[PDB]
Design a protein around this ligand. Structure first.
Ligand SMILES: CCCCCCCC/C=C/CCCCCCCC(=O)OC[C@H](COP(=O)(O)OCC[N+](C)(C)C)OC(=O)CCCCCCC/C=C/CCCCCCCC
Ligand SMILES: CCCCCCCC/C=C\CCCCCCCC(=O)OC[C@H](COP(=O)(O)OCC[N+](C)(C)C)OC(=O)CCCCCCC/C=C\CCCCCCCC
Ligand SMILES: CCCCCCCC/C=C\CCCCCCCC(=O)OC[C@H](COP(=O)(O)OCC[N+](C)(C)C)OC(=O)CCCCCCC/C=C\CCCCCCCC
Ligand SMILES: CCCCCCCC/C=C\CCCCCCCC(=O)OC[C@H](COP(=O)(O)OCC[N+](C)(C)C)OC(=O)CCCCCCC/C=C\CCCCCCCC
Ligand SMILES: CCCCCCCC/C=C\CCCCCCCC(=O)O[C@H](COC(=O)CCCCCCC/C=C/CCCCCCCC)COP(=O)(O)OCC[N+](C)(C)C
Ligand SMILES: CC(C)CCC[C@@H](C)[C@H]1CC[C@H]2[C@@H]3CC=C4C[C@@H](O)CC[C@]4(C)[C@H]3CC[C@]12C
Ligand SMILES: CC(C)CCC[C@@H](C)[C@H]1CC[C@H]2[C@@H]3CC=C4C[C@@H](O)CC[C@]4(C)[C@H]3CC[C@]12C
Ligand SMILES: *[C@@H]1O[C@H](CO)[C@@H](O)[C@H](O)[C@H]1NC(C)=O
Ligand code: ALF
Ligand SMILES: [K+]
Ligand SMILES: [K+]
Ligand SMILES: [K+]
Ligand SMILES: [Mg+2]
Lengths: 986, 277
């Protein structure tokens, strides 16, 4: 960690520090010693835990601890049974079933457990294999790994930098820092200390960056992980192991359920122990409690529903790498998004053009076919000709049918933008360019900042010479003697100069690259047609031009970005733009896209409007803030928190990846779920750190995709709002499913408590409740996930992570006490009906379990005096258990019907709106019929055939459940916030 | 707060009171259908089971005649059962009637209605259980190799056993078949090996027949016919191998009577006896 950057040092200082020479360089022996000391020039991959370890760790998450305890208790009970000879068995079956359930839940959780993998492979395209290094005063190609700090390296054009080097001898070297800043604009390189910040020093080449053109010589100052790219990779890979909000909510729900189960088990175990109960019965009852209290199929159902939502979203061209990412989006409070490539097409295009003393607006859509901006007016033909002729960019071959915007052009970015504009508006420039016999003299230089090209018109009448000029507007103007307005070349005046200056000021303030265009006519008297020309600028004039027009390029935002941003903001999500671009362009794009409202103004804007010093203006009035990289650098965490809290709309510019990660962390410190959208390597740390990271598909780099939880294959920003809606809907449906499962949990639990307390014959067996959990409750639980939104999802604000939980106290109270007890009562009614009709009245069943289960007794007397054998008693017990199970299923049908909506009535939501509900009801009925008749026809698993009437005994109780829930929801709707909404609403 | 707690507690009290009221109302509505005289269904207890008096733990009867404590449990249980069969308990003629001493056809004593008050019961005297009545015999039969078990048929309300038809020969010529008014009962070694050591079996029943007389049935449910005395059939072996465990199965033969593999006590016995010398 060498953070003491050294770029201000001169050549002699560098030589003294690293003990090397520019001409000589590091010696081979010295190079080997340095390799041994420091190490190879490579990025060390992160340590990855074996997938087997993760799979086994998945065997203890959730309720698996309780299931393992239950299996151990079942084995103990079976051992006790074997000791005291008893061929009952039925415990090994329970143990095997519990073990299989644990295994299945572990597998489902593993398939739901993120993706892991590594991100170092993403840098394969970068990280050049070999480099040219001078050793012993000689140049020899050496592998990049063997490269060590101190040796002299030379980089030509079109090759990756071998390592972080400090340029010493550069001749017009240009490099691309898209990896660091995320901007593809070439950056000039030199050998002087330009900027204090090393990232902008302008005299330091960076590892894995590409040298666009020119040649330079540099001294290695960093290697491997010590390089900037190495540190970014370390941040991206190392960090990123955290629990998503959905996982935290699931853990909280598991904690609640496990605590309830453990507390009930302890209390009732102590009670049974203090009631003169054999340890065997105590352990059996403990196993029953554990089975009843643990919803086995809930977690697998959650995984299945998440997978279904992921499949639908992928069908919507929104790939989801991590399964929990579907829910993570939505319930998000802050969105930190990159400017270039994410909110912008990343393609330089002409937006505004000023001529005739008035401003025009040009279409900036990527799929646009053509646009019109008062083209009928004069002075437009001259501008079109000047743009078409005065250009060097060319289309790549084989792009006839390819869209012109999507075509590839071999030239400068601005040149490509003008070429695209001319193709869109004018037509095919190839024929136009061919018509005019352009003169090879096309001198353009950085110092000149103008380029002119002599042309001869193809008009038969005129057939005269045409000179075209463009460049920096100021020098173009000062080479302009007259200005042509609507055809006439009005001489340049003070008024015209002032208007031009004002237009240039406004265009520059809109953060656009303004370029001036001017041409002159050459009468045949001075320069005849055969007159020969020289590019040395001596054969032709270079002044007294006629200014024609002015236009700028902005790199406009994506077509759908503004609408998506507006919808996200209206949905209560705060949008923050973090970019590595210049503050002016960032502010302009933020205003255009809608991150900053039109009426809202920054403190600098307020000061400018009031014509006062910035310190004088109070910060309260300003509702928007633009913070550069340096200000964030010299900002304590408290100041950052205050800034985030106080300002609704914030724009960050010139931020390094570390600063992006700092911003993400600061946002997360406000108890807010943050989602980061990016498409660049510099976004990798932020994408990893953020709760959900969305990476742009087509424009995104491999690193962004690998470090992103979600990928937008089609690069449409409306997928963000779609995902927000899907996440909120998933949250609601998960609440409904959890309540549905808990209701049946309590319904199963109550009978065992009654059996222990009142000593009734076992109303229901453990295997029956296992069948309830893993059978009839699967399809209904999945169907509840298909429910439509009851109200407008977007209108609601994002849910607070702390205050709002997936499973709250009201939900548990309603599911456990309110609806669970109703189902228990219905089941007990059916049980008593079953027993009474066979000769056992309800009062005779009190404290009858001890004699009931005694295998020795074969003449037990019922209420009518009849005597029952042991087997007949247990067959009646199985019939009662089956009746209880059927009653539970029947009441669970009404439970599902009521649970399909939380506030609306069934009449409003529509009974048949969701067909998966009816599929689930049919599944419940079919499973019950199979278990009762197919199984049970031969008595197995405590199942027996049931009489017809025993199916319909519990219907009135289901009707009562539905009526009660409907009345509750009706009174909630009638009186909002009237002590009924506060308590009853869940 | 206190007020909110009071409101919530009141709501829950009312809600649970209403739930309990609904539950008890549904239970009472269901109970209205059932009748206190006869059960609605007799699916489970339709074919009556066969059970023994000594009420042994695991179908095992092991004892040593020398030590009284070995057979004290069995003797005490048998005495406890037979207590109500003494002639003193049947001295009252208001409810006990001296029915025929010879087996007769089942006598319908009315219908299952609250009218006609109660029903009289044909009394059963212990004298018919010769060698096992306990009147003259002491400790019943549990002297040296004389185990005695009393076989009884599980009471089923409104059930009239049908003795096997003479169409097919039940077993070895019974001579005293008398199928019109006797339900045959036979005891034999469970497996081929046991038959060798089981020795001979002595049956003591009413009138000398080896079965339950039909005059006692049908039973009327302990409400219309309280103090009902079911017929008994005492079985005594009097000769069996010593220090060897014998599996003995007792079976009741009748067209109405049924059998099942799942239920071993449905019209059949599985009893193991071992007299430790
Ligand atoms: C005899 C055998 C009976 C068997 C029947 C089944 C019994 C099973 C019962 C289970 C109940 C489980 C309760 C789960 C609690 C979760 C804890 C938790 O993490 O909750 C989170 C909440 C968050 O709330 P918030 O900030 O969103 O609220 C905002 C309020 N606003 C709107 C005013 C601003 O924290 C809170 O509210 C505080 C929650 C405190 C919960 C106290 C529970 C007290 C005791 C319950 C035992 C019930 C016995 C029933 C006996 C029945 C016999 C017939
Ligand atoms: C997709 C969502 C819905 C899932 C529904 C799952 C339902 C599972 C129920 C299966 C019961 C099938 C019964 C078929 C019996 C045919 C008998 C003939 O005739 C002599 C036979 C002795 C039979 C012993 C039992 C054999 C097989 C049943 C095994 C079931 C195990 C289930 C464990 C998980 C609850
Ligand atoms: C066990 C207990 C199970 C029973 C428990 C609950 C049943 C409650 C009764 C059913 C619910 C009421 C009927 C209902 O609310 O209907 C509504 C729909 C029409 O709503 P919409 O689309 O015009 O709303 C438009 C909304 N806006 C105005 C915003 C555009 O009416 C329709 O579609 C046509 C059907 C309406 C007529 C009633 C049909 C009754 C049939 C079945 C009930 C469920 C029995 C389940 C038994 C087990 C089956 C195996
Ligand atoms: C508004 C629309 C929904 C209305 C409610 C629908 C659900 C309840 C309605 C009917 C359920 C019972 C009837 C089911 C269909 C008829 C099946 C049946 O045949 O059912 C008869 C049993 C009573 O049979 P039994 O004594 O006449 O048979 C004598 C047999 N033998 C002659 C051999 C001695 O009816 C019984 O169990 C009655 C059980 C009493 C408790 C039921 C719950 C009462 C709560 C209210
Ligand atoms: C945690 C537990 C808290 C509660 C504990 C309660 C303990 C009660 C124990 C003993 C009290 C006995 C006092 C009455 C006996 C004499 C009167 C009599 O016996 O009348 C009985 C009838 O009763 C009634 O009509 C009222 C209903 C009484 C139902 C009692 C059910 C007992 C079962 C309780 C378990 C409930 C479990 C619920 C759990 C829910 C969890 C959320 C006898 O009718 P029968 O059979 O002769 O009718 C024959 C037919 N017919 C009437 C047409 C002639
Ligand atoms: C009379 C008896 C049967 C009532 C038993 C009620 C018991 C089971 C209830 C009452 C209070 C409940 C606890 C309330 C708060 C918490 C903290 C939470 O982080 C885990 C669940 C846990 C620990 C609950 C478990 C269940 C609980 C202990
Ligand atoms: C009858 C006795 C013995 C057992 C049942 C007691 C009932 C009334 C108790 C047990 C648990 C209690 C609830 C526990 C938690 C809450 C959440 C709180 O924000 C409002 C009160 C409320 C909703 C309580 C209401 C009363 C309650 C339901
Ligand atoms: C058994 O009874 C018979 C008469 O039925 C009697 O002769 C015999 O002596 C009795 N048994 C014993 C051991 O006395
Ligand atoms: F396009 Al960027 F940081 F501005 F990735
Ligand atoms: K359960
Ligand atoms: K992430
Ligand atoms: K459940
Ligand atoms: Mg980008």
């Amino acid at each position: 960690g060498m953070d003491l950057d050294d770029h201000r040092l001169s050549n002699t200082e560098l030589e003294q520090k690293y003990g090397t020479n520019i001409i000589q360089g590091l010696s081979s022996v010295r190079a080997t010693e340095l390799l041994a000391r420091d190490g190879p020039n490579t990025l060390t991959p992160p340590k990855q835990t074996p997938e087997i370890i993760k799979f086994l760790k998945q065997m203890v998450g959730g309720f698996s601890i309780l299931l393992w305890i239950g299996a151990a208790l079942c084995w103990i009970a079976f051992v006790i049974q074997y000791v005291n000879n008893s061929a009952s068995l039925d415990n090994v079956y329970l143990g095997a079933i519990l073990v299989l359930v644990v295994i299945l839940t572990g597998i489902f959780a593993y398939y739901q457990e993120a993706k892991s993998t590594n991100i170092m492979a993403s840098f394969s395209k970068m990280i050049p294999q070999q480099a040219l290094v001078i050793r012993d005063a000689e140049k020899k190609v050496i592998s990049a790994e063997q490269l060590v700090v101190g040796d002299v390296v030379e980089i030509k054009g079109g090759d990756q930098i071998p390592a972080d080097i400090r340029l010493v001898f550069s001749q017009g070297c240009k490099v691309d820092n898209s990896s660091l800043t995320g901007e593809s604009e070439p950056q000039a390189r030199s050998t002087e200390f330009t900027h204090e910040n090393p990232l902008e020093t302008k005299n330091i080449g960076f590892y894995s960056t590409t040298c666009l053109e020119g040649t330079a010589t540099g001294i290695v100052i960093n290697t491997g992980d010590r390089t900037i790219i190495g540190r970014i990779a370390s941040l991206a890979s190392g960090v990123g192991s955290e629990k998503t909000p959905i996982a935290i909510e699931i853990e909280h729900f598991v904690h609640i359920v496990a605590g309830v189960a453990v507390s009930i088990g302890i209390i009732f175990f102590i009670t049974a122990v203090c009631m003169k109960y054999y340890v065997l019965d105590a352990i059996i009852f403990l196993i029953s409690i554990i089975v009843a209290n643990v919803p086995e199929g809930l977690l697998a159902t959650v995984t299945v529903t998440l997978s279904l939502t992921a499949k639908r979203m992928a069908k919507k061209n929104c790939l989801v790498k991590n399964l929990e990412a579907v829910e993570t989006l939505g319930s998000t409070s802050i969105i930190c998004s990159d400017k270039t490539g994410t909110l912008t097409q990343n393609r330089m295009t002409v937006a505004h053009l000023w001529f005739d003393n008035q401003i025009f607006v040009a279409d900036t859509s990527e799929n646009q076919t053509k646009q019109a901006f008062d083209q009928s007016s004069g002075t437009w033909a001259s501008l079109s000709k000047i743009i078409t002729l005065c250009n060097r960019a060319e289309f790549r071959p084989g792009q006839e049918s390819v869209p012109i915007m999507k075509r590839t052009v071999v030239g400068d970015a601005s040149e490509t933008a003008l070429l695209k504009f001319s193709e869109v508006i004018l037509g095919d420039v190839m024929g136009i360019r061919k018509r005019n016999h352009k003169v090879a003299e096309i001198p353009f230089n950085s110092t000149n900042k103008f380029q002119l090209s002599i042309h001869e018109t193809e008009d038969p009448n005129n057939k005269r010479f045409l000179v075209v000029m463009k460049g920096a507007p100021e020098r173009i103007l000062e080479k302009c003697s007259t200005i042509m307005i609507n055809g006439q070349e009005q001489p340049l005046d003070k008024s015209s100069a002032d208007s031009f200056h004002t237009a240039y000021m406004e265009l520059g303030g809109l953060g656009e690259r303004v370029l001036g265009f001017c041409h002159l006519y050459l009468p045949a008297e001075q320069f005849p047609q055969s007159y020969i020309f020289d590019v040395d600028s001596v054969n032709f004039p270079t002044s007294n031009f006629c200014f024609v027009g002015l236009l700028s390029m902005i790199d406009p935002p994506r077509s759908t970005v503004p609408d998506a941003v507006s919808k996200c903001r209206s949905a209560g999500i705060k949008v923050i733009m973090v970019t590595g671009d210049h503050p002016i362009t960032a502010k302009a794009i933020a205003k255009s896209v809608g991150i900053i409202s039109a009426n809202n103004e920054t403190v600098e804007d307020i000061a400018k409007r009031r014509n006062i010093a910035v310190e004088q203006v109070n910060k309260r009035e300003a509702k928007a803030a633009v913070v550069t990289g340096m200000e964030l650098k010299d900002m304590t965490p408290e100041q950052l928190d205050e800034l985030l809290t106080n300002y609704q709309e914030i724009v960050f510019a010139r931020t390094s990846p570390q600063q992006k990660l700092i911003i993400v962390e600061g946002c997360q410190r406000q108890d807010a779920i943050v989602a980061v959208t990016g498409d660049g390597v510099n976004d990798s740390p932020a994408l990893k750190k953020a709760d959900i990271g969305i990476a742009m598909g087509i424009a995104g780099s491999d690193a962004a995709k690998n470090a992103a939880d979600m990928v937008l294959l089609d690069d449409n920003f409306a997928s963000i709002v779609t995902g927000v809606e899907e996440g909120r809907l998933i949250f609601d449906n998960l609440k409904k499913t959890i309540a549905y499962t808990l209701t049946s949990n309590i319904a199963e639990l109550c009978p065992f408590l009654i059996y222990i307390v009142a000593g009734l014959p076992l109303p229901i067996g453990t295997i029956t409740i296992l069948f309830i959990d893993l059978g009839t409750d699967i399809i209904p639980s999945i169907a509840l996930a298909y429910e439509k939104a009851e109200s407008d999802i977007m209108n609601r604000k994002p849910r607070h992570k702390k205050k709002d939980r997936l499973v709250n106290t009201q939900l548990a109270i309603y599911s456990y006490l309110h609806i669970g007890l109703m189902q228990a009562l219905g089941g007990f009614l059916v049980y008593f009906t079953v027993y009474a009709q066979q000769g056992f009245w309800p009062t005779s069943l009190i404290n009858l379990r001890v004699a009931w289960e005694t295998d020795d007794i074969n003449d037990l007397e019922d209420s009518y005096g009849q005597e029952w054998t042991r087997y007949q008693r247990k067959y009646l017990e199985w019939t009662g258990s089956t009746a209880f199970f059927v009653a539970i299923m029947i009441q669970q049908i009404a439970d599902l019907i009521i649970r399909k909506t939380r506030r609306n009535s069934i009449f409003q939501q529509g009974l048949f709106r969701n067909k998966v509900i009816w599929v689930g009801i049919a599944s419940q009925v079919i499973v019950a019929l199979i278990l009762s008749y197919g199984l049970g026809s031969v008595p197995a698993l405590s199942f027996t055939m049931l009489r017809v009437q025993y199916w319909f005994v519990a219907v009135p109780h289901a009707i009562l459940i539905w009526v009660y829930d409907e009345m509750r929801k009706l009174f909630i709707r009638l009186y909002p916030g009237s002590w009924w909404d506060k308590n009853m609403y869940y | 707060t206190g007020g909110s707690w009071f409101k919530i507690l009141l709501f829950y009290v009312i809600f649970y009171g209403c739930l309990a009221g609904i539950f008890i109302g549904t239970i009472q509505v269901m109970l209205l259908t059932i009748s206190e005289l006869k059960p609605t269904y007799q699916d489970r207890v339709a074919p009556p089971g066969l059970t023994q008096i000594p009420q042994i733990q695991k179908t095992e009867i092991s004892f040593r005649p020398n030590d009284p404590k070995s057979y004290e449990a069995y003797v005490l249980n048998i005495i406890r059962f037979l207590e109500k069969y003494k002639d003193s308990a049947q001295k009252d003629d208001m409810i006990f009637e001296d029915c025929g001493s010879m087996p007769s056809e089942p006598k319908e004593r009315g219908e299952f209605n609250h009218e006609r008050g109660e029903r009289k019961v044909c009394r059963f005297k212990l004298d018919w259980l010769g060698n096992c009545s306990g009147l003259n015999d002491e400790s019943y039969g549990y002297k040296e190799g004389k185990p005695c078990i009393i076989i009884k048929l599980n009471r089923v309300l409104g059930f009239k056993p049908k003795p096997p038809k003479n169409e097919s020969l039940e077993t070895y010529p019974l001579t005293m078949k008398y199928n019109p008014n006797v339900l045959p009962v036979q005891c034999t070694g469970k497996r081929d090996e046991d038959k060798d050591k089981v020795g001979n079996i002595e049956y003591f029943g009413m009138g000398g027949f080896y079965g339950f007389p039909l005059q006692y049935y049908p039973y009327y449910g302990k409400l219309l016919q309280p103090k009902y005395l079911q017929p008994l059939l005492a079985v005594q072996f009097t000769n069996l191998t010593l220090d060897t465990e014998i599996r003995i199965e007792c079976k009741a033969y009748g067209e109405n009577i049924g059998y099942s593999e799942k239920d071993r006590f449905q019209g059949r016995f599985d009893v193991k006896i071992e007299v430790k010398s």
